[PDB]
């Protein structure tokens, strides 16, 4: 997160902290708590992860520093990556891990609501992007969780903004007219989470921008929205 | 019903009583005239149900007490379950009913206008349940059709009453905190009906609930709006 | 368009006059440039046309007199069809064409917004229905490019005043209850425009009616919101 500052422990208890263990453990993306068994992450943080016995999710973290081989962890049970997805910059980036045990919820870990298609006539005014990715384009992952606030931005601004991209009504932007705050690198398949009639909804999935922060470059997010009916057919068992 | 009212004669001119032959003649479920040989009811009606010889379908009723062996009444030529329908707690519980003949519409009994997709950011305020249901759990099949006015509860509301299920966007929710008033056995496939801008809209199928009218239990009802593509597809001649 | 008025030159340039050059050229229906390569129009508009290689689309015209052999024009590539459409009052009444070439935007010639899904919600207050069509039920093509401001009608309204058909919500309705103001013959396949808090939609395409202007008889368009999924999926590369 470019531009952010510290998060209070805790205030942002359905964000997830996503680790490989291959070749050395170490953070990959974000996530959120979406259900009991259930994180909602980005499809592209699982190129070339080739099987899910090398991931490992940590709950209820504010540092990295508290992880270490002692530390508790869910594993991953099944990837779940939406058919359509090739690419971040063509939209569906999305997918599901189903975890290996239940999460028992806490004030540390608890899941975040969905948006809901009466919604997405709401203006949200109140959203944050929170990871622990880079504060620059070259840099590294940061120890505490970081936040930052960052207005909504029309799709067609949006697209102003990328004219050789496709933005669709898929996907979500975020970003201020001058930058300085943004989602970087390592916050990928983090919530951009919207506070609303006192109600935190995942109303974005961390995506992809060009750089981090830049000046008339929005971050690019999965409009969660366009896929409550896709989440629902996956989190179904058979 | 549970805590309802008798309803003036044709003041829901959309509900119908649908009646089966076997072994003996008695009521069924409730239904909605959504078309002229249309009728919108719940799958789970239909359980045990082998051909659709053994129904009818009665318009323009005020009291079980109008039906005799001389009442006319509508053949159903098709039961339509949704393909995607098990059990009623596990949502897609819609099914249509396609009549042998065509309702001629009158002031006793007229369709009921489906929900818009525009309509789903509106609060809807003015919501009734309808039916020949029990007044309590144990009970049985009343006289005269009832209504109860109760309000929409909210889906993060609905799923803490019911930790043991997962209410889905393709369910709703109404019920008073303290209880008192619900749907209950009997009353199943009826309308949830809800006046706004001065016209009556099909909001819900009564479902389920965990007994009826209890404290922290609101009734479950089919989202109707989620559906108005699949009755689209399926009301149209092939 | 019966009733309406002289447009100044550019202020609708989304709008395109689609050729056909067989037996001899001449305009066939209206269509809105969406994309650097995409042009969105009725399916209607093409009964009888057998290839892409006898259409021609004119962009940044205000009179038909513009077009010479001379002219420039684009070539088709692909017309694309939606493949539920049988025939405009039954709805699906939409088709891409796929330009050989891409247009290079202007004043003249630009883009307009497909409506969000979010906006289903907007009570859109200014629509108006643009095109070369006849002003009256039998005339003749007209030179300049005319406007008429109409307001929408709700599908309830839309349903009453069609009792022969089924006006479902993938349709939308505009008209004058005493009629004068529609679109007519040779207006197929062009835009419903509605301002929105100062950006143009595309909220319709001019798809049938009985008659032209009649009283009580609105115009019905494509309800183009309920195709973004898919114009998305029919507008990416494979
Ligand atoms: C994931 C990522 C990597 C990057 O370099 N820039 C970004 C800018 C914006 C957003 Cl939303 C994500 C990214
Ligand atoms: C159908 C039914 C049976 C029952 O026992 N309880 C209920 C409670 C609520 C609602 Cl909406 C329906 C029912
Ligand atoms: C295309 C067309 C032909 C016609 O004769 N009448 C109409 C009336 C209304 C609308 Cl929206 C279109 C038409």
Redesign the interface.
Known sequence: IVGGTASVRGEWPWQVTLHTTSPTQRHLCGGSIIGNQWILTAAHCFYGVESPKILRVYSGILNQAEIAEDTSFFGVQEIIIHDQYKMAESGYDIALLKLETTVNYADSQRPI??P???????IYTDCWVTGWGYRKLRDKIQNTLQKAKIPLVT??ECQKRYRGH?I???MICAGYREGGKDACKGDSGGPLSCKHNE?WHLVGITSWGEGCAQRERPGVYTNVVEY?DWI?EK?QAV
Request: proline content about 0%; aromatic content about 0%.
């Open positions: 609501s969905l809901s298609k009466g919604e997405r006539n709401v799709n067609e496709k669709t009504h898929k109600v409550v629902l989190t």
